[PDB]
């Protein structure tokens, strides 16, 4: 099945700005302030090259440096709508892309000699962060989400095309973040910011919004934008970064967001105005429903960011923000999906991947041969740097295979480094660990083969051992409480796995497998093909299980343990 492939960089930061102009035509817009341009493909996607557009397409008035205004095709007309993502003007095309460019009054005339400052002082100005305009009721009406901060989401609503507008009577709204352990203090508040919205086959919209909370929350209209139902949490993992919803040709409806647990907060987090620093951005992910949305499959991470273990990822090459957060996608043909995701230049990337890939039911990794592609192995040095960061340290590292040959494998210990602590901020992330993705089941069988390191261990060194529906840093031990599945390996007195109340011992020094079978509330284990016991789900889930976390347990610097390779099956449902 075709693996996700990056084919180039986009000219901003994702989520806007990428527009398909015919069938093989396809360009990412971007936000800079000299003479427009954009990235142009001419084969649906596989080679691109920048380009400068022609004279009568208008600059930026409006907008940041790093972000593309938004593009979108009006399906009655054939023309395009451009808004930015914060300021500037309402523009709309006459014979395309390429064509001639007019701006939208404040009295519902369109301007064709925007180029005069004088005649742009009584342009239309939509007020707002503002998302993607989205044509609803057989493209009848366009709406454009736009928020505040603190203040939630409402909508931009037109029914001429973008000649005249309105706002929504009410929108999206989510509760502020409730410091309660494990945190240490409260997370940003953004209030229901950021959505995206899809109209179902009944006609209902849907809108899913960036939270505080643990997942990215929703509403519901039935008036085509003008009011919305009360808000409630999806079930979409994340915090603090962007979703995105669309629909393929035959109906099917993709779901892009980064799904991804933060580390708690700190005892310096802050009130909660703005952020304090960023643990939970360096993937991107994927899920489709064929039934609108009654189930979903998929959950699979199309990309890791490629920097992430690095000591200098906060500042290298600017210190705006980076990672894999925030995207757009395009169709490119029955199998495969183009998507923009990410920020800054070093981090930003268009990507193809194939629904076959999505809805594959298997998944395998060798920690020697794929830890820089599939693994999430950081933990990170507490100190912020950049805007809202920290600089990393890979929190496991490959070693010879003491049976010997030529494989490498990944050891996971607890760590003698004091970098890795900050006791103003109260955090200790020097417990190594590691976790990858498969794609998602309720039903479903992993198995993994590990040995414990021939070396001193501390009283509580070991391996826990979690199930989870998000990706949970490497570096965080609080996984296990929001865990699907959870247990540990225990290295003392001697080598066992605790299941429950009952003790499986196993010899150190030596490979052995763990088989987890999970279906429903609970979890068969073996251990090297034997029926070993049994666990209860310790938290249900409204997905299934699509990630493995190991964390190292031991409280003093120890040997810890050895893990070589995973494999994962889930059942179709
Ligand atoms: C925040 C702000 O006022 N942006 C305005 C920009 C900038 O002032 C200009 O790029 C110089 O920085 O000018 C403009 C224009 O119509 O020329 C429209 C836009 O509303
Ligand atoms: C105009 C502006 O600030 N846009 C920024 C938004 C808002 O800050 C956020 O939606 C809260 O309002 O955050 C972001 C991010 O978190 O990566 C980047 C984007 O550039
Ligand atoms: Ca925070
Ligand atoms: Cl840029
Ligand atoms: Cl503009």
């Not at 949490?233 to 979703?243: E, H």
């Not at 199998?335 to 298997?362: C, E, F, M, P």
């Amino acid at each position: 099945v075709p693996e996700p492939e990056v084919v180039a960089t986009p000219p901003a930061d994702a989520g806007r700005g990428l527009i398909r102009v015919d069938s093989r035509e396809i360009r990412h817009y971007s936000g800079t302030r000299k003479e427009p341009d954009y990235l142009v493909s001419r084969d649906n996607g596989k080679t691109w090259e920048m380009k400068a557009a022609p004279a009568g397409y208008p600059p930026n008035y409006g907008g940041i440096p790093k972000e593309s205004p938004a593009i979108v095709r009006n399906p009655l007309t054939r023309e395009f709508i451009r808004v930015q993502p914060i300021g500037g003007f309402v523009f709309l095309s006459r014979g395309g892309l390429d064509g001639k460019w007019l701006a939208v009054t404040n009295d519902g005339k369109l301007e064709e000699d925007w180029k005069d400052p004088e005649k742009r002082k009584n342009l239309k100005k939509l007020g707002g962060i503002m998302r993607t305009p989205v044509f609803v009721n057989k493209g009848r009406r366009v709406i454009v989400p736009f928020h505040n901060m603190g203040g939630g989401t409402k909508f931009h609503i037109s029914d001429d095309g973008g000649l005249t507008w309105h706002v929504s009577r009410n929108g999206v709204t989510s509760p502020r973040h409730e410091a309660r352990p494990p945190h240490q203090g409260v997370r940003w508040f953004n209030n229901a910011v950021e959505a995206t919205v899809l109209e179902m086959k009944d006609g209902t919209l849907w809108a899913l919004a960036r939270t505080s909370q643990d997942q990215a929350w929703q509403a519901f209209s039935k008036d085509y934008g003008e009011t919305w139902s009360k808000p409630e949490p999806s079930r979409f993992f994340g915090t603090l970064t962007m979703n995105t919803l669309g629909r393929l040709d035959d109906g099917t409806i993709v779901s892009l967001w980064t799904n991804t647990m933060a580390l708690p907060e700190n005892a310096t987090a802050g009130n909660g105005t703005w952020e304090d620093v960023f643990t939970n951005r360096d993937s991107h992910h994927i899920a489709m429903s064929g039934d609108e949305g009654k189930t979903w499959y998929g959950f699979r991470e199309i990309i890791l960011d490629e920097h992430r273990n690095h000591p200098g990822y906060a500042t290298l090459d600017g210190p705006e923000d980076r990672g894999k957060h925030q995207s757009e996608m395009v169709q490119l043909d029955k199998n495969r999906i183009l998507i923009s995701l990410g920020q800054h230049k070093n981090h930003r990337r268009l990507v193809i991947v194939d629904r076959r890939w999505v809805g594959a039911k298997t998944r395998a990794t060798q920690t020697g041969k794929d830890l820089d592609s599939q693994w999430t192995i950081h933990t990170y040095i507490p100190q912020k740097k950049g805007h809202c960061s920290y600089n990393r340290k890979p929190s496991a590292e490959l070693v010879q295979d003491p049976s010997g040959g030529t494989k490498k494998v990944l050891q996971i210990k607890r760590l003698d480094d004091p970098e890795l602590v900050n006791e103003k901020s109260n955090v200790d992330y020097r417990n190594g660990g590691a976790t990858w993705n498969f794609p998602n089941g309720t039903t479903g069988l992993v198995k993994f083969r590990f040995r414990v390191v021939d070396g001193e261990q501390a009283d509580d060194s070991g391996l826990q051992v979690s199930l989870t529906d998000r990706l949970f840093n490497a570096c965080d031990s609080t996984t296990k409480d929001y865990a699907l599945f959870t247990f540990p390996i225990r290295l003392k007195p001697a080598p066992h796995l605790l299941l429950g109340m009952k003790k499986v011992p196993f010899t150190p020094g030596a490979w052995h497998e763990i088989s987890l079978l999970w279906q429903g509330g609970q979890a068969v284990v073996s251990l090297d093909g034997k029926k070993a016991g049994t666990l209860k789900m310790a938290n249900k889930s409204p997905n299934g299980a699509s990630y493995i976390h190991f964390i190292s347990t031991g409280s003093q610097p120890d040997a810890g343990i050895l893990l070589d390779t995973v494999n994962a099956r889930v059942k179709a449902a």
